[PDB]
Write a protein that binds this ligand. Structure first.
Ligand code: SF4
Ligand code: SF4
Ligand code: SF4
Ligand code: SF4
Ligand code: SF4
Ligand code: SF4
Ligand code: SF4
Ligand code: FES
Ligand SMILES: [Ca+2]
Lengths: 147, 191, 147, 571, 905
């Protein structure tokens, strides 16, 4: 529910305020360790899959942004990432913070995404390989190709 | 086919058969009269706003026995149109160019008469904002056919003094097969 | 008049109604073309096939009023109404210039050959179950065992 | 800062001059998107405010426009005086290269405005049009009558309560008008026309077709009131009826030779209302099509003026227009996004074929027009006026630059990326003669060929529609395979694009002069007010000021030398 | 309280919501889950603005406008960068999985999601993944279901459960595969399920009756009219196209019918587009039914009425005030007979006596919801006129609202109010012959014969005030519940008593008046409402006249040889054989009607009248207010051979041709002047709407939107020449779009709500001074009734107990919503909704007869043995038999009558 920290934040005392100023929070004070052999993209994909499928169905942003994060992270897993996905995830994290949603499920969902983008950005960049293609041809209509 | 008889916009028309099926010299002489009226047609292109300039790329009244009403039917110019219509001499025919002469034609507003059909009879209509000169020419052929199948009084002394207009088959029913049987078209992304 | 005149493919002449590659009429009997008409020379009424698709019960166009400016073709979201390069019109009576549905619907796809609107719509269609359209997932049941 | 921003223009020094002259009070500055300072002047201060503007060190010398507006149904009126009606005067100063707007508020009970013809003599037809279309009366006005509608017309058309529909056509009224036309010369009363009552013979002399009454001293002509309004289509009243998107063909049909040039100002003013900044490719396409239709109009004008004393050129331009757009004459191709479709895959070949064959046609045209001594002798010294009868009678066409006044809209107030195209405008010297006007339009045609060559050289490959959500219609492929684009296409086709309540104004160098659109929006999907200022209106108003002391042949040679269009005059 | 929006001061209420405060100011904030009548939740997050703490603040915080109080000193911003892009993101998330089927959708130009997607300015799509789908359900004959269009803003379930009290709709599923519907496939049995069509901002719940013969919103020609299906008189907007009425929408009025209709008025418009309706005047000689125009019909009818010795006019409770008055002027006052039974007319007259002479205030439909204890005597309110029952549900929820207000939680958040409530209900005591649909919320339901309900009311009145007459024979087990009702009504600040003429007994009205008077005696703010039978039965009672029985006796006696029946079937109010014999004995029978009734056979002249869609008229509500309905379309626009004129027009021209031998196609305002000059108690009907010479800034008001499409091709299939527009000289409306429908226009009657950027039914909030309140510039219809200074007397006539008798059966009405209205059964879509013709029996009575449930039984009435299938009623009493009134063959006047020979068939 909390967000990832690096080795430099391992020396902080496990307190509410001490981890609060580190861009994080203490939470349930049960630490979760991730080693070097595990891709951050897959781990955050599993986190977002849990938060998407285990959320309630009340309010819009969690309901229709956590599956979008799940699909983006699956595309990053399979190497089918398109330019404009990491920025979409950052905007999603900024718009799923406290107060923007009905309850505090979504901020705790998007804190791991925020820390994964902030710290382990290079794997998310490496998940993008194929160019952006949302629309397909109609073969009788000239497309609005912009520069 | 059967005809409508006009005899001496508000008058009444009745649908009867032609009087030629009831003499053999009158049949061929009326055919020659209709042939002569069909082949030599003298138009009077009325000078209006923006269909008249379009048929420029394609004379005095009362020698031209035909009026082509081009532009928009303005309420100030509608008396001019009717007066110029009664100037011409029988027989006379009317070809309407553009939507503005058939109907109101994109101007359903206070200062526009909804076509010359409101006040003068029209023989041939041409639809659409400015028609091509080839559309005017095909309307000329259609009206030539309509004139060629007619029964007008050959003299004002002896004979039936009534004008018989033929009920032509409509062009949408005649050309229905060739229009419905169109499978594919060129894409608009090229020239 | 002997030699035919060449006209470009993007020529605004006679209005036709267009079929899809499947064979039915593309027209879903909305009123976008009737209301985008500045003259107001399009009239139609929606009827519904007993299993699925909409179609026009009638489709009449007053060509004595039409100015061939192409707003209806531009406003069709099904590419059903199109403006052919054919211009050889002109009739004897104005009443016969009102082209009905049988005078407009042609037997093939015109300027937009491969497009089909119902392959994008999400409604239940004869030959198209729910979740069979493009970029559309199969319906997960409300009673399904997965979370 | 974007060019479409709602500015108040209190930094304009003319506002400071007005504050120094008439005090900080007594006029209300309105913040619009027109790009000009708009001041609400009280009714009794109007004549002295105009007199002060006429006596500035760089005075406002030309009355660009003068028309009314029905404020009764206008809901969004914030920062505006309590007005049932309003009369706006648009004034242009060329030395300042600026323009101001003067709005006078009126109530229902007293629709009386002091006349403006004692200051600007071109205000006569504008005040007659305001009295015709609205109910506004002008005090101290000679022959104040209906100019667009006949005198036997009851209501006022541009009023909001007047229905904008064609009523039932009664033949009885048409027979009254036919009988009136039969006795028009018999019961002619030269006091309603504003005429002087034995040589003087009164006759109605029947491009377009319009009557012009004539007073004869033998053959020499002493007074003339050109009767206009015979081609009145009600473009503005239909502008109050159609939406922002359906009015584009009506903007094509005011001037048929211009067409796309005439749907340019409406599109630009609509984009100013919507806050849309179109990309550079859209600007280049607009410039190319506008100069293409300008070449069409100039070639037809030169051919018409030279015929009485051409086919393949206009056919090739019309073939190119048919390739780019729909049919040739009225394209209806400029959208709020900027164009309807993208350019096809063969326009380079057609434009290069057009541009590699027209310079020798220009050489032939100049060789013809420089050697016809009969045409030069017939066209020299006729209807001579230098800068004074052209600075006060409108006259914004080729005559304004024939007087030597260096004022082109494409250079003074550039639009649609015309600053990126290098072209030197032509200006005449001294007398605005007819032959000088024709030579100026020949040089304008050469400059338009140069602009087309520049457009063919460097065409950007960006989008053909802007990314703004108010681009009507949205791009078609995204409409067909995305749902938000389908929403925008649906609601911009069905009801119309909802635009915020602002006031916009676009001034455009047309094919024959300066055409301008002035759009007032009430926040709805229609236009609350559409005003189309036309050059040919002011070009037809100046015939009495120029052909007093000439013959009928001189009058009709001048009429042919004027590039006016009757449908352009009567809207 | 004052607020600051975008650095601009505004004076709003402090006790209401911030979203509704901003929408009341004309500001635009998008919203999905908020409704003015349903409170505020957070099911969407669309109304987000940025709130600051003090005047000088830059960061702010994104809050919800519908969940922030509009307290004094708030500084909010709507159109800054962050809130605008967040609302764009929310509409992007909602439209992430939304089907690409807008042109094939029923909403189209009526969709709120389209307006709020355009308003947020979201056009480009960057979601490239797959969408979400759901299976649809069969919700019945009226509601089409398309669950894929849903955005899960929870408004439908909140309305249907919290507001409507229905037990069908609900939320199923989970995070993203959420569902809104029924647990199975079946018909929504709530009487207010039709409001889900406009409650849903998407195309999920749509109108099936409008799905068939569908057109878009801008193609509809609208008019403000009054629903003619029962006595509540809910304000409706019927809209037509191509000469047939296509869809009835809600018309806002903050006094009667604010936001919600019932299913009968929403889906009973199918009788006006039947192809068997009279369209031309038809006259018979022998067996020849020839067709006349208007002038020949008037001349011939005037000739036969002149040659007659005495004329009698039989009015109807469904015709307007103008039509009934025109009949009252065509025939004499001394011979003018209201076409209702003597007992039903007597009940109507005493109900009117309690209304305008009982000295007790009668509330409107909106202010029923403010009462504290409701006692319904005899009436099946939820089935006769259901909108009063919905207001009764709201009045019951008023106790939970009061308990929430005691805890200082704001009234616009209904979740906390329902949390505090927890089945805390205001006292509702309903009495009926069987079960009702209000029994789930009622404090007590009394299943008893009608006389026993009357004695219960008399006992309540006696125990509330000893001056009332006493009741002998009350059992103590019933006396305890009598005491329960007495202490419930005595402690209520605003008690409400509901009765009506459909109960079939005079004494129920008497007992309700006695209870109301006893509550008024002890200083309570007691109100009374009476549910009448038809739309203008109260207006007919105010106009007055003889009964239908007196007309029939005048017919077979031979005193009158000419009868003019205006819009009456005449089989609902009297026996069929007697009416048929009386009409066959009459030498001249004229029937002025728009529905092909049974008496049009062997009727010597038939005048094709006009329905509410094709006529102008005035109708009086059950509360007594006189509203007026306007013509929607000209019937002669398409197929101009039909004349189809107004009923008052027909009768006035017939009277003019009778007197001066010439026709006079009069005007509506002339008839209104004649009514207010002849009848003094009807003088208030020239205050409902202004004259035909009323203009806002010189122009009329448009029946159709500005984007009315296809004007030049609408009639092109029969005439390419466009005809002139129909001229409406009767009223303030023009038949074209050249009018005025501005929200900021000085008028009370709105044909349809449309605002730029608000194409949905949620454009009504632009037409009101404050949203969810009264309409701006007043409300349509004036009350016409003033409370008397003194009340009536205590009605001493207390009936005895209902003793069952052998060989005879007391008939009890049931009054189904979809089958007990004469104009509703003729609608083809109702015929699948009405139950099969049945008859209810007690288990003891069925055991005595030996008949099992579901089998046929035969009973004889008027010498006619008819066989109906039985069903067992648990709540019915012994010695009674139950029938659905209003059906084919079962008259509504059969209530309270006797029955003989219940033999098994
Ligand atoms: S944020 Fe909370 S209330 Fe909103 S949908 Fe997610 S779990 Fe439910
Ligand atoms: S149809 Fe078009 S080109 Fe012809 S007169 Fe009308 S507007 Fe002009
Ligand atoms: S081309 Fe234009 S005028 Fe013709 S039907 Fe289409 S929208 Fe209407
Ligand atoms: S032609 Fe196209 S726009 Fe018109 S109703 Fe059919 S699908 Fe809709
Ligand atoms: S079905 Fe309609 S009202 Fe119900 S939650 Fe979905 S969008 Fe909202
Ligand atoms: S409910 Fe609205 S957004 Fe959804 S498909 Fe229908 S019209 Fe489109
Ligand atoms: S409660 Fe009565 S008046 Fe209201 S909609 Fe229902 S049937 Fe009509
Ligand atoms: S309107 Fe839904 S969160 Fe406020
Ligand atoms: Ca009427």
């Amino acid at each position: 529910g909390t967000d990832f920290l690096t080795e430099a934040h391992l020396d902080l005392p496990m307190e509410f305020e001490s981890i609060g100023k580190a861009g994080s929070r203490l939470g349930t004070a049960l630490a979760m360790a991730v080693d070097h052999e595990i891709n951050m993209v897959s781990l955050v994909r599993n986190l977002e899959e849990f938060f998407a499928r285990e959320s309630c169905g009340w309010c819009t942003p969690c309901r229709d942004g956590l599956p979008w994060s799940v699909k983006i992270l699956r595309a990053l897993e399979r190497g089918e990432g398109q330019p404009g996905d990491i920025e979409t995830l950052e905007q999603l994290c900024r718009f799923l913070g406290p107060g923007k949603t009905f309850c505090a499920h979504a901020p705790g969902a998007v804190e791991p995404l925020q820390s994964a983008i902030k710290y382990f950005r290079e794997e998310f960049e490496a998940g993008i390989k194929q160019p952006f293609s949302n629309t397909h041809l109609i073969n009788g209509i000239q497309p609005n190709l912009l520069k | 086919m059967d005809y409508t008889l006009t005899r001496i916009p508000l008058q009444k028309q009745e649908i009867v058969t032609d009087p030629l099926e009831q003499n053999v010299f009158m049949g061929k002489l009326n055919d020659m009269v209709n042939w002569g009226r069909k082949n030599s047609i003298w138009p009077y292109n009325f000078g209006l706003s923006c269909c008249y300039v379009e048929m420029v790329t394609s004379a005095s009244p009362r020698q031209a026995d035909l009026m082509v009403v081009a532009g928009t039917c303005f309420t100030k110019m509608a008396p001019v149109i009717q007066r110029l219509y009664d100037q011409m001499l029988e027989p006379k025919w009317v070809i309407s160019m553009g939507a503005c002469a058939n109907s109101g034609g994109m101007y359903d507003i206070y200062s526009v008469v909804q076509g010359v059909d409101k006040f003068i009879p029209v023989d041939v209509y041409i639809p659409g904002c400015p028609p091509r000169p080839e559309a005017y020419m095909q309307a000329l052929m259609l009206l030539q056919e309509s004139i060629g199948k007619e029964r007008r009084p050959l003299s004002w002394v002896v004979g039936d003094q009534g004008v018989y207009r033929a009920n032509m088959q409509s062009e949408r029913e005649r050309k229905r097969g060739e229009r419905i049987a169109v499978t594919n078209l060129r894409t608009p992304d090229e020239i | 008049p002997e030699e035919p005149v060449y006209l470009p493919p993007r020529y605004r002449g006679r209005i036709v109604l267009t079929r899809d590659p499947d064979g039915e009429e593309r027209c879903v009997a909305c009123n976008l073309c009737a209301v985008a008409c500045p003259v107001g020379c399009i009239s139609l009424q929606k009827a519904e096939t007993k299993d699925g698709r909409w179609y026009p019960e009638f489709f009449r166009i007053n060509f004595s009023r039409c100015i061939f400016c192409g707003l209806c073709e531009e406003a069709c979201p099904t590419t059903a109404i199109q403006l052919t390069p054919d211009f050889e019109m002109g009739e004897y009576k104005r009443q016969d210039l009102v082209y009905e549905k049988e005078d407009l619907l042609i037997s093939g796809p015109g300027k937009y050959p491969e497009y089909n609107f119902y392959r994008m719509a999400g409604m239940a269609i004869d030959g198209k179950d729910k979740g069979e359209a493009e970029n559309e997932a199969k319906p997960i049941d409300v009673k399904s065992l997965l979370p | 800062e974007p060019a479409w921003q709602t500015r108040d223009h209190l930094d304009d020094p003319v506002i400071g001059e007005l504050r120094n002259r008439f005090g900080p009070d007594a006029f209300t500055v309105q913040a619009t998107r027109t790009g000009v300072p708009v001041v609400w002047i009280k009714r009794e201060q109007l004549l002295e405010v105009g007199d002060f503007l006429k006596k500035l060190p760089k005075p406002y010398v030309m009355l660009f426009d003068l028309h009314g507006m029905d404020e009764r149904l206008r809901t969004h009126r914030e920062g505006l005086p309590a007005a049932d009606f309003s009369v706006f005067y648009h004034l242009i100063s060329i030395d300042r290269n600026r323009d101001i707007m003067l709005k006078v508020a009126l109530a229902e009970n007293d629709l009386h405005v002091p006349t403006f013809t004692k200051l600007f003599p071109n205000a006569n037809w504008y005040e007659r049009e305001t009295w015709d279309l609205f109910g506004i009366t002008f005090d101290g006005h000679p022959n104040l009558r209906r100019i667009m509608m006949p005198q036997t017309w009851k209501g006022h058309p541009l009023r909001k309560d007047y229905p904008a529909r064609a009523t039932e056509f009664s033949p009885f009224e048409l027979t009254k008008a036919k009988q009136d036309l039969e006795m028009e010369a018999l019961t002619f009363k030269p006091e309603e026309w504003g005429m002087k009552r034995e040589d003087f013979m009164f006759l109605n002399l029947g491009h377009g077709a319009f009557r012009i009454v004539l007073q004869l001293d033998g053959e020499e002509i002493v007074d003339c009131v050109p009767d206009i309004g015979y081609h009145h289509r009600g473009a503005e009243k239909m502008g109050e009826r159609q939406s922002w998107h359906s009015y584009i063909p009506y903007t094509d049909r005011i001037e048929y030779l211009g067409g796309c040039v005439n749907e340019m100002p409406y599109v630009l003013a609509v984009e100013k209302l919507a806050g849309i900044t179109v990309p550079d490719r859209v600007n280049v396409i607009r410039v190319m099509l506008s100069e293409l239709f300008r070449i069409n109009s100039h070639l037809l004008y030169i051919s018409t003026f030279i015929q009485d004393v051409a086919f393949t050129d206009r056919q090739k331009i019309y073939d190119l227009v048919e390739a780019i757009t729909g049919f040739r004459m009225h394209p209806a191709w400029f959208r709020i996004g900027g164009v309807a479709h993208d350019l096809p895959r063969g326009w380079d070949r057609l434009l290069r074929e057009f541009l590699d064959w027209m310079p020798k046609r220009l050489a032939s045209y100049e060789k013809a027009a420089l050697q016809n001594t009969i045409l030069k002798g017939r066209s020299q010294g006729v209807a001579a006026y230098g800068a004074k009868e052209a600075l006060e009678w409108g006259t914004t066409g080729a005559g304004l630059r024939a007087t030597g006044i260096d004022f082109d809209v494409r250079k003074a107030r550039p639009y649609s990326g015309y600053e990126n195209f290098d072209f030197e405008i032509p200006v005449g010297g001294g007398v605005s003669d007819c032959y000088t006007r024709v030579m100026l339009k020949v040089e304008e045609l050469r400059q338009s060929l140069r602009i087309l060559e520049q457009c063919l050289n460097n065409m950007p490959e960006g989008p053909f529609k802007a990314d703004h959500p108010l681009t009507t219609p949205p791009p078609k492929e995204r409409t067909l395979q995305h749902i938000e684009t389908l929403i925008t296409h649906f609601l911009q086709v069905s009801w119309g694009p909802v635009m915020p309540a602002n006031e916009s104004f676009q001034m455009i160098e047309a094919t024959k002069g300066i055409n301008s659109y002035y759009l007032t929006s009430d926040g709805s999907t229609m236009s609350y007010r559409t005003r189309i200022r036309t050059p040919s209106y002011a070009h037809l108003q100046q015939i009495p000021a120029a052909i007093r002391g000439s013959l009928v042949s001189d009058l009709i040679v001048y009429l042919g030398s004027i590039d006016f269009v009757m449908s352009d005059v009567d809207r | 309280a004052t607020i600051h929006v975008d650095g601009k001061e505004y004076e709003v209420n402090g006790a209401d919501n911030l979203l509704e405060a901003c929408l009341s100011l004309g500001l635009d904030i998008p919203y999905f889950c908020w409704h003015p009548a349903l409170g505020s939740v957070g099911a969407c997050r669309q109304c987000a603005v940025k709130q600051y703490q003090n005047a000088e603040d830059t960061r702010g915080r994104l809050v919800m406008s519908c969940m922030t109080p509009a307290s004094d000193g708030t500084f909010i911003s709507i159109d800054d960068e962050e809130a605008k892009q967040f609302r764009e993101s929310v509409v992007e998330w909602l439209m992430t999985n939304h089907p690409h089927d807008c042109p094939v959708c029923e909403e189209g130009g009526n969709c709120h999601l389209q307006d709020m997607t355009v308003m947020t300015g979201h056009s480009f799509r960057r979601y490239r993944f797959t969408k979400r789908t759901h299976r649809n359900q069969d919700l019945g004959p009226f509601i089409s279901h398309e669950m894929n269009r849903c955005i899960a803003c929870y408004r439908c379930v909140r309305y249907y459960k919290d507001y409507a009290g229905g037990t069908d709709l609900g939320v199923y599923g989970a995070h993203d595969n959420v569902y809104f519907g029924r647990p199975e496939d079946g018909t929504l049995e709530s009487e207010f399920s039709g409001n889900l069509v406009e409650i849903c901002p998407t195309g999920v719940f749509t109108d099936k009756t409008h799905s068939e013969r569908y057109n878009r919103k801008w193609d509809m020609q609208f008019a403000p009219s009054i629903c003619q299906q029962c006595s509540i008189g809910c304000n409706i907007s019927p809209g037509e196209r191509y000469g047939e009425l296509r869809r009835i929408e809600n018309r806002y009025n903050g006094t009667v019918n604010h936001y919600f209709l019932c299913d009968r008025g929403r889906f009973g418009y199918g009788y006006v587009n039947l192809k068997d309706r009279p369209r031309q005047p038809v006259q018979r000689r022998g067996d020849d039914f020839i067709t006349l125009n208007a002038e020949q019909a008037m001349q011939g009818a005037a000739d036969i009425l002149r040659q007659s010795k005495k004329v009698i006019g039989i009015g109807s409770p469904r015709a307007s005030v103008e039509s009934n008055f025109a009949l009252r002027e065509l025939v004499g006052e001394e011979n003018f007979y209201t076409g209702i039974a003597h007992g039903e007319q007597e009940r109507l007259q005493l109900a009117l006596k309690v209304l305008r002479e009982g000295g007790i205030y009668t509330p409107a439909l909106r202010e029923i919801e403010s009462y504290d204890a409701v006692l319904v005597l005899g009436e099946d309110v939820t089935q006769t006129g259901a909108r009063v029952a919905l207001a009764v549900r709201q009045a019951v929820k008023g106790k939970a609202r009061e308990m929430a207000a005691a805890q200082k939680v704001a009234d616009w958040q209904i979740a906390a109010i329902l949390n505090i409530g927890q089945r805390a209900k205001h006292p509702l005591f309903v009495t009926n012959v069987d079960d009702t649909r209000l029994d789930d919320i009622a404090a007590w339901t009394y299943r008893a014969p009608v006389e026993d309900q009357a004695r219960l009311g008399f006992a309540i009145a006696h125990a509330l005030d000893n001056s009332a007459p006493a009741v002998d024979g009350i059992e103590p087990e019933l006396q305890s519940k009598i005491d329960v009702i007495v202490q419930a009504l005595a402690g209520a600040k605003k008690p409400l008593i509901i009765s009506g003429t459909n109960a079939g007994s005079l004494e129920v009205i008497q007992a309700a008046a006695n209870v109301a008077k006893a509550l008024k005696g002890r200083g309570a703010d007691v109100g009374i409402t009476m549910i009448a039978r038809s739309v203008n039965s109260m207006g007919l009672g105010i106009m007055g006249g003889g009964s239908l029985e007196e007309a029939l006796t005048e017919l077979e006696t031979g005193r009158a040889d000419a009868v003019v029946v205006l819009e009456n079937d005449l089989h609902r109010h009297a026996s069929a054989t007697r009416v048929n014999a009386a009409l066959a004995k009459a030498p001249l029978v004229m029937v002025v009607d728009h529905q092909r009734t049974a008496i049009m056979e062997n009727a010597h002249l038939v005048l094709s009248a006009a329905s509410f869609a094709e006529s102008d008229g005035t109708v009086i509500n059950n509360e007594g207010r006189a509203q007026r309905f306007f013509q929607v379309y000209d019937p002669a626009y398409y197929d101009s051979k039909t004349v189809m004129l107004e009923s008052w027009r027909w009768l006035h021209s017939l009277h003019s041709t009778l007197l001066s031998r010439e026709v006079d196609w009069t005007q509506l305002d002339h008839v209104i002047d004649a009514v207010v000059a002849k009848i003094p108690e009807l003088a208030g009907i020239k205050d409902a709407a202004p004259d035909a010479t009323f203009r806002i800034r010189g122009q009329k008001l448009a029946r159709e939107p500005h984007r009315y499409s296809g004007r030049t091709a609408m009639r092109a299939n029969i005439s390419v020449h466009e005809p002139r527009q129909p001229q409406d000289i009767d009223t303030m409306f023009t038949f074209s779009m050249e009018g005025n429908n501005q929200p900021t226009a000085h008028r009370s009657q709105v044909p349809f709500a449309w605002a730029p950027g608000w194409n949905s039914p949620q454009a009504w909030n632009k037409f009101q001074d404050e949203v969810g309140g009264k309409l701006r510039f007043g409300d349509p219809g004036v009350r016409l009734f003033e409370t008397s200074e003194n009340g009536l007397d205590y009605f001493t006539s207390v009936p005895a107990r209902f003793q069952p008798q052998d060989g005879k059966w007391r008939i009890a009405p049931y009054y189904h919503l979809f089958g007990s209205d004469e104009l509703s059964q003729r609608a083809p879509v109702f015929q699948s909704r009405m139950p099969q013709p049945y008859i209810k029996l007690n288990p003891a009575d069925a055991a005595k007869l030996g008949v099992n449930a579901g089998t046929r039984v035969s009973f004889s009435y008027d010498g006619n043995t008819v066989t109906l299938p039985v069903e067992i009623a648990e709540g019915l009493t012994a010695g009674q038999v139950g029938l659905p009134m209003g059906m084919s063959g079962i008259a509504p006047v059969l209530a309270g009558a006797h029955l003989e020979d219940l033999k098994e068939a």
